[PDB]
mmCIF file of C-alpha atoms (C1' of nucleotides) and ligand atoms in Angstrom:
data_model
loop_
_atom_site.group_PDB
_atom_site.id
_atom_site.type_symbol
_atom_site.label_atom_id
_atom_site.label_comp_id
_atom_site.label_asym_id
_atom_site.label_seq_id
_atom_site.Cartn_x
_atom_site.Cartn_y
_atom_site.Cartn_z
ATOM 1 C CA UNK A 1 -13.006 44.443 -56.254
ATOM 2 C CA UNK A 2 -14.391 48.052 -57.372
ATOM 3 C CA UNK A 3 -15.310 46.434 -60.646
ATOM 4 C CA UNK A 4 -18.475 45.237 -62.158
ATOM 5 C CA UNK A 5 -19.956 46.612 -58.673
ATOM 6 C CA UNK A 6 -23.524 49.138 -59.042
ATOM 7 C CA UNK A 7 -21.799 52.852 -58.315
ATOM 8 C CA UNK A 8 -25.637 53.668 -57.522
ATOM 9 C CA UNK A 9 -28.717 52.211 -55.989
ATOM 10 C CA UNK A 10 -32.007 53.180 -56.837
ATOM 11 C CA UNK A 11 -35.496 51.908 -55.443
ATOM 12 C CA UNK A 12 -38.249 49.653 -55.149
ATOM 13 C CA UNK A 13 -40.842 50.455 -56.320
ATOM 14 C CA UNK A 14 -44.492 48.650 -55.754
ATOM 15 C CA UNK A 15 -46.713 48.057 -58.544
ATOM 16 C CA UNK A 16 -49.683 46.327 -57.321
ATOM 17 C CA UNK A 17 -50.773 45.194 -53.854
ATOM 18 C CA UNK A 18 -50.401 41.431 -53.329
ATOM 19 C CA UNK A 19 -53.544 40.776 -51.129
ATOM 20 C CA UNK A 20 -56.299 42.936 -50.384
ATOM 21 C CA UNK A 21 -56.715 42.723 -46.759
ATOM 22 C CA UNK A 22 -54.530 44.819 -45.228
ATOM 23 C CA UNK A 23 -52.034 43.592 -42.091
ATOM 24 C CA UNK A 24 -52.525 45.481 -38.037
ATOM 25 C CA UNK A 25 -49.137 47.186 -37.850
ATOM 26 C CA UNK A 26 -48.413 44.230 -34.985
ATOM 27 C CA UNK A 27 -48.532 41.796 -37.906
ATOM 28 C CA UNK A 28 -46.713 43.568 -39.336
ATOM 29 C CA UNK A 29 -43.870 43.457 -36.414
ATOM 30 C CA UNK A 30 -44.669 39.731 -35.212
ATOM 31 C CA UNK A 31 -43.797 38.465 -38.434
ATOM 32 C CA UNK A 32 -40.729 40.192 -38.589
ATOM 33 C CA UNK A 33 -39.523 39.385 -35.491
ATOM 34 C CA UNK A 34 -39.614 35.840 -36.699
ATOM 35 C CA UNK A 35 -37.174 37.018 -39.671
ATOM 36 C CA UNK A 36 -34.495 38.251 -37.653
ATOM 37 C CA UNK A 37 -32.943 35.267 -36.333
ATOM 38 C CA UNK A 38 -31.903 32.578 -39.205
ATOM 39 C CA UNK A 39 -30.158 29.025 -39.417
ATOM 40 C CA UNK A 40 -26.822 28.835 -40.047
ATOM 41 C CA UNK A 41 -24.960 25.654 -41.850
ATOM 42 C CA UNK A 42 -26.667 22.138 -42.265
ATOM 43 C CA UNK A 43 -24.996 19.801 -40.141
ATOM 44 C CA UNK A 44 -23.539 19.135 -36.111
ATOM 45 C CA UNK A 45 -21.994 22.792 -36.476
ATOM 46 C CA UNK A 46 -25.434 24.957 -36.602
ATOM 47 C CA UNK A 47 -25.551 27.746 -34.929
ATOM 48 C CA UNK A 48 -28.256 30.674 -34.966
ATOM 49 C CA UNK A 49 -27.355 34.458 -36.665
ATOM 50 C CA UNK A 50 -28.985 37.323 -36.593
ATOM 51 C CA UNK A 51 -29.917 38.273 -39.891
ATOM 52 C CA UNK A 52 -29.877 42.827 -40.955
ATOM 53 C CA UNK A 53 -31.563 44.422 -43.470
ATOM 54 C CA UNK A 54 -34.314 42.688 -42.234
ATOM 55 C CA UNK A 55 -37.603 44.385 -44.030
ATOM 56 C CA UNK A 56 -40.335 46.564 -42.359
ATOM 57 C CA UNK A 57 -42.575 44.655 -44.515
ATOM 58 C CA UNK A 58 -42.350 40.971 -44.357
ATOM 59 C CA UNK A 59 -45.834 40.175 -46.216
ATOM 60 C CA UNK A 60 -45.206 42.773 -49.201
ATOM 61 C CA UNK A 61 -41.270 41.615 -49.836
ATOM 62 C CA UNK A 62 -40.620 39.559 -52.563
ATOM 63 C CA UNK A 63 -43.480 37.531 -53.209
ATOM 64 C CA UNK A 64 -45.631 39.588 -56.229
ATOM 65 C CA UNK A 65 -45.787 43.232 -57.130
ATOM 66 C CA UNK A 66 -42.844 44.448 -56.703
ATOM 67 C CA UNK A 67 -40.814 45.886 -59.352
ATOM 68 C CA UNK A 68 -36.838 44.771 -58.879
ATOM 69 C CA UNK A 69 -33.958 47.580 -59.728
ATOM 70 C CA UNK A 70 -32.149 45.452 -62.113
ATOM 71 C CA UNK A 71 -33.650 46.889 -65.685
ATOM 72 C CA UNK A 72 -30.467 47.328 -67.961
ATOM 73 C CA UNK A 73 -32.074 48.992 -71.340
ATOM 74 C CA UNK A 74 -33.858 51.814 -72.164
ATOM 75 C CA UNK A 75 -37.046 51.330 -72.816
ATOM 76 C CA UNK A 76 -37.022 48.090 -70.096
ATOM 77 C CA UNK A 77 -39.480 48.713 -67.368
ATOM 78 C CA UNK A 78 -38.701 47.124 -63.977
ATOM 79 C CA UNK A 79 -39.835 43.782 -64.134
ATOM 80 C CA UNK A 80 -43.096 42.561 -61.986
ATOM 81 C CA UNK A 81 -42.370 40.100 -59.517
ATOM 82 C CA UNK A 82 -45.319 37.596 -60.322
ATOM 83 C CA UNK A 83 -47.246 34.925 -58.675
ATOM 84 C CA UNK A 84 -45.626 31.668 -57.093
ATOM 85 C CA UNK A 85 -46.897 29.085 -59.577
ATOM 86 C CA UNK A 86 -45.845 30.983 -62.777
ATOM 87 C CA UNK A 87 -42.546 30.657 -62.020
ATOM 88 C CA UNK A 88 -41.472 26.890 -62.705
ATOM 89 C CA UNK A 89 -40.416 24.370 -60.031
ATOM 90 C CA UNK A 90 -40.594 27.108 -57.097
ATOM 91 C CA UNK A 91 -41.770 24.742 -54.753
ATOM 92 C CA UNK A 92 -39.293 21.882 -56.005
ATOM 93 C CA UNK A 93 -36.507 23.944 -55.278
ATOM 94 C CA UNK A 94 -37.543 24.872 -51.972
ATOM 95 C CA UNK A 95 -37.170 21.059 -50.680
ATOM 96 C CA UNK A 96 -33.768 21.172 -52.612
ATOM 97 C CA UNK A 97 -31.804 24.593 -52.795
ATOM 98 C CA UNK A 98 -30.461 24.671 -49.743
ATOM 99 C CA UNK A 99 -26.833 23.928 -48.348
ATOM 100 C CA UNK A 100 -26.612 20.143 -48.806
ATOM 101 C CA UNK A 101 -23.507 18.516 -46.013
ATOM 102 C CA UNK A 102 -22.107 15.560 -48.519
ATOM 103 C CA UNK A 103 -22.425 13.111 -45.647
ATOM 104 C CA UNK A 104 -26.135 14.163 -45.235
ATOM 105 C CA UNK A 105 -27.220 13.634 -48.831
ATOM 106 C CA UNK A 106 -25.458 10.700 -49.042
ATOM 107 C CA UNK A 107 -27.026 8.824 -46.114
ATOM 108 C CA UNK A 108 -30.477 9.838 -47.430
ATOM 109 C CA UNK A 109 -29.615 7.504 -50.760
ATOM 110 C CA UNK A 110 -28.268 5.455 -48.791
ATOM 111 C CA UNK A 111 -31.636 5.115 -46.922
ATOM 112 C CA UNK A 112 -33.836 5.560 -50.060
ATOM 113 C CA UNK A 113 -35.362 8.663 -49.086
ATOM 114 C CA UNK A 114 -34.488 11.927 -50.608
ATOM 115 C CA UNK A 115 -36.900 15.186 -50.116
ATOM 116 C CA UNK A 116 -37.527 15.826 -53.892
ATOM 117 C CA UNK A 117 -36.018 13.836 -56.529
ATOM 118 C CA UNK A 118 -33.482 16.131 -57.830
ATOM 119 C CA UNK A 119 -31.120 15.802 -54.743
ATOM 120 C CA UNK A 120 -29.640 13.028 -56.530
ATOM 121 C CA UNK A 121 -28.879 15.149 -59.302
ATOM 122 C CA UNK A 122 -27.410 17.888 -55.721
ATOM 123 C CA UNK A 123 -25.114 14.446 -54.868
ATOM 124 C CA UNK A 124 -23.548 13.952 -57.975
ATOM 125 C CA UNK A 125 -22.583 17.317 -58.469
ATOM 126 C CA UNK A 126 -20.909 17.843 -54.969
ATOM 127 C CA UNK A 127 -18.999 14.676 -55.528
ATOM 128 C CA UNK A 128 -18.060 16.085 -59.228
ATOM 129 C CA UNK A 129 -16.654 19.204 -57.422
ATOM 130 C CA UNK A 130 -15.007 16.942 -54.522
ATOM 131 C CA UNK A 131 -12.871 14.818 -57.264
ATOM 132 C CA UNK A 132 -12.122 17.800 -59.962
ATOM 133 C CA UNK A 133 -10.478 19.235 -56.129
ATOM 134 C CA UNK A 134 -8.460 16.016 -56.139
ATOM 135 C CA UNK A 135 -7.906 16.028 -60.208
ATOM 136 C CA UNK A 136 -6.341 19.701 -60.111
ATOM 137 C CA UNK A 137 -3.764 18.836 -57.783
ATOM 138 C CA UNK A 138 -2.754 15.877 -59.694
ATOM 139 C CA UNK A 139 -2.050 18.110 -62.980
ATOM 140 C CA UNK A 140 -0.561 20.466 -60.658
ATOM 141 C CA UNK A 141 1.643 18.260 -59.014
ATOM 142 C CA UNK A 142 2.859 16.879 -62.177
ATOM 143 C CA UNK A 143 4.469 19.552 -63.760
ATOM 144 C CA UNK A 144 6.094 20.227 -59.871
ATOM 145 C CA UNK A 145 6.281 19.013 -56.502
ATOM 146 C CA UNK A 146 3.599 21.324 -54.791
ATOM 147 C CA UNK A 147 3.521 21.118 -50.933
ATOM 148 C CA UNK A 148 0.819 21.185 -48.878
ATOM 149 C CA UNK A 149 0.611 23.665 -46.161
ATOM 150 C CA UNK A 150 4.451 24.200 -45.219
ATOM 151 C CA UNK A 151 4.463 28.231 -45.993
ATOM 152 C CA UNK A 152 3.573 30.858 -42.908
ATOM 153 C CA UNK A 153 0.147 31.501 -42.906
ATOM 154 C CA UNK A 154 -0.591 35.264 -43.095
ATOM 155 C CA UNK A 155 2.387 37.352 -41.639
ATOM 156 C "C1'" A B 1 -23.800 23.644 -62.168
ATOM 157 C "C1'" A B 2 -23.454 20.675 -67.818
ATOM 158 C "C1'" G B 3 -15.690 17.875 -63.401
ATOM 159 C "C1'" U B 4 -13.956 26.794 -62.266
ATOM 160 C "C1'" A B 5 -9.543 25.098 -59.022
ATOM 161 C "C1'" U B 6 -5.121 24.476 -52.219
ATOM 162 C "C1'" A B 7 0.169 26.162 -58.157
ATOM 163 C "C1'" A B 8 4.187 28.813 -61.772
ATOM 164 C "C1'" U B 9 3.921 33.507 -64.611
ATOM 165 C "C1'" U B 10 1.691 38.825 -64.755
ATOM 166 C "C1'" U B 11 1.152 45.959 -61.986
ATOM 167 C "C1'" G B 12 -3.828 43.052 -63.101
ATOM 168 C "C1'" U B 13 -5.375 39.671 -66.981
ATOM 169 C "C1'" A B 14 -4.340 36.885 -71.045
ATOM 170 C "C1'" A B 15 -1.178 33.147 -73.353
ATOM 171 C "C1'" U B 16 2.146 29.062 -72.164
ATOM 172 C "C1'" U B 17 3.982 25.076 -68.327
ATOM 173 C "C1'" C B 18 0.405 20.673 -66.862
ATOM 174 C "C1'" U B 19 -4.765 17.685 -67.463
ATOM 175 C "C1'" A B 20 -4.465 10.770 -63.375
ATOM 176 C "C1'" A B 21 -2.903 3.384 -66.486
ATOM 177 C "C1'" A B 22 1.004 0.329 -65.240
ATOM 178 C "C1'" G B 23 2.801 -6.471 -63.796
ATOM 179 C "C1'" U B 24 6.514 -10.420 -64.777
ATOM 180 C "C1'" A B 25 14.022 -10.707 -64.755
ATOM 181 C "C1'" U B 26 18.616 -11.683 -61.143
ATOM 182 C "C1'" A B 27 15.641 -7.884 -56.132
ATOM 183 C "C1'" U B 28 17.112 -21.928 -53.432
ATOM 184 C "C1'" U B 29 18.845 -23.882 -50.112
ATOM 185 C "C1'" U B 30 22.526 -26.384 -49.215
ATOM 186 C "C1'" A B 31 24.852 -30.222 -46.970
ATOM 187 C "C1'" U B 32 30.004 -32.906 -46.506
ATOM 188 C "C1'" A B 33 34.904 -30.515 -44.622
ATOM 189 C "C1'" U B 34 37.779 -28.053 -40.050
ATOM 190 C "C1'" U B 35 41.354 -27.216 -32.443
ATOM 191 C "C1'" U B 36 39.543 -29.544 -27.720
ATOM 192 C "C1'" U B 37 33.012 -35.279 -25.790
ATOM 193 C "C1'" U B 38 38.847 -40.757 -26.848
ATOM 194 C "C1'" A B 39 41.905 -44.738 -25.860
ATOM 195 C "C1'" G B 40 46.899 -47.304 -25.555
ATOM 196 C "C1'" U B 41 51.343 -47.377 -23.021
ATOM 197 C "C1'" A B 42 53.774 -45.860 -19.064
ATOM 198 C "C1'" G B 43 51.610 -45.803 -14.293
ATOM 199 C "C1'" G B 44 49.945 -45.998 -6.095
ATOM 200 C "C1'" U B 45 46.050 -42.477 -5.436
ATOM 201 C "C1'" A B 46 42.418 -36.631 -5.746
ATOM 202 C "C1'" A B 47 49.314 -31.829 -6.247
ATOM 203 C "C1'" A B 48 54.183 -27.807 -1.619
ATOM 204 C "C1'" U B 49 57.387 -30.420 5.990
ATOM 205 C "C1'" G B 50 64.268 -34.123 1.156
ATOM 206 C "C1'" A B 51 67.509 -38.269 0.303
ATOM 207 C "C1'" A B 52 71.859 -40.444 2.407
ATOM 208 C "C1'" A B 53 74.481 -48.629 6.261
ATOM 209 C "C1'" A B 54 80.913 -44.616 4.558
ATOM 210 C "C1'" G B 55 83.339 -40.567 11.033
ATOM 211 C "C1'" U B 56 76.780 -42.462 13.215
ATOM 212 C "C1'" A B 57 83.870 -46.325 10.669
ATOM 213 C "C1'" U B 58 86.107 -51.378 11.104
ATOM 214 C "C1'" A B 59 85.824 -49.851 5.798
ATOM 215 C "C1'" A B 60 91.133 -49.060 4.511
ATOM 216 C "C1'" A B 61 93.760 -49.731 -4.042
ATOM 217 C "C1'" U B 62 89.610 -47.919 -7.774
ATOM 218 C "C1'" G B 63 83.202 -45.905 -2.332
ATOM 219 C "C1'" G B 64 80.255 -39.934 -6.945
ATOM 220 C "C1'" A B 65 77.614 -37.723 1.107
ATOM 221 C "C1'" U B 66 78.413 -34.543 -7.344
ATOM 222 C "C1'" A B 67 72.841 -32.629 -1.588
ATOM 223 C "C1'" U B 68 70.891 -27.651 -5.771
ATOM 224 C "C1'" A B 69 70.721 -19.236 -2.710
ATOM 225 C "C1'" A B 70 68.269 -15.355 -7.862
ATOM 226 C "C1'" C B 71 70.180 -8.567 -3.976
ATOM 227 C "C1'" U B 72 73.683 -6.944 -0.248
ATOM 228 C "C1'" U B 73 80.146 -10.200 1.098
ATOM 229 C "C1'" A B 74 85.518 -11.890 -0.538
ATOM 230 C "C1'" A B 75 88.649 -12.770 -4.825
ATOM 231 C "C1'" U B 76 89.016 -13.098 -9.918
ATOM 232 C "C1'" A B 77 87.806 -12.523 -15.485
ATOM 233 C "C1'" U B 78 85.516 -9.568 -19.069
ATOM 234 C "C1'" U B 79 82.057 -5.255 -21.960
HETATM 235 MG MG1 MG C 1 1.098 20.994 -73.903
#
RNA sequence: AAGUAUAAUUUGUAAUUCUAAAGUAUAUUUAUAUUUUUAGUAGGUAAAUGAAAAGUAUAAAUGGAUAUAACUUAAUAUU
């Protein structure tokens, strides 16, 4: 929808430099040419994409003096990206932000191992969302008999 | 993620339908009784090629040789 969407885009712009040493131009490309190409899905179907808008500058990105777009009042200066450790539990949700299969998580309690604690916390949440799936229905079906995939399917 | 989603309704929302529990009672059987596993009496036996001691006469007054075609005939009675 056309709504709640930017109608403009403006710029990044680069406040300090986050190392002093600065890259050969064929760092520059030989780390980028490992961004390109991503993982897709976490489970037997995984296949490989190729990722756009992939930056000219991998080292200068995201990771500290840059200034994002997203400043909403007047007087609100773009806001500093700032160093790693500032911002909390960074490297915590590295192990655990990432698509988690339900079978997958649920074999790694089974099996006592989990990559940072929290993906218990990733578990009971899917499951939560699996069940409220199966709860809807069951208020929905109440009120009237609601069929499951007998309609034509586009046109 | 701090249970927001496979519906109905609306131009699009909103509001309102709805928001998961479910057991015992009635959902124990009949048997006896009836149409065909038997004897007793008759009565050769296990199923289809008739019987005449009276003309086959010495026999002459009470001898049954009464032994039997359902479609073509002949005559007669009917409806
Ligand atoms: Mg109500």
């Amino acid at each position: 929808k056309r709504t709640g969407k930017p109608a403009d885009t403006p710029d990044y712009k680069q406040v300090y430099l986050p190392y002093d040493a600065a890259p050969t131009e064929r760092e520059l490309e030989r780390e980028r040419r490992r961004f390109k190409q991503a993982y897709h899905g976490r489970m037997e179907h995984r296949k490989l994409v190729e990722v756009k808008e992939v930056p000219l500058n991998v080292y200068t990105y995201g990771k500290e003096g840059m200034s994002l777009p997203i400043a909403i009042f007047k007087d609100q200066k773009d806001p500093v990206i700032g160093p790693e450790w500032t911002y909390p539990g960074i490297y915590e949700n590295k192990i655990a932000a990432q698509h988690w299969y339900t079978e997958e998580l649920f074999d790694k309690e089974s099996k006592e191992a989990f990559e940072s604690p929290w993906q218990q916390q990733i578990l009971d949440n899917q499951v939560k969302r699996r069940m409220a799936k199966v709860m809807f229905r069951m208020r929905q079906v109440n009120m009237k008999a609601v069929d499951l995939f007998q309609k034509e399917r586009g046109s």
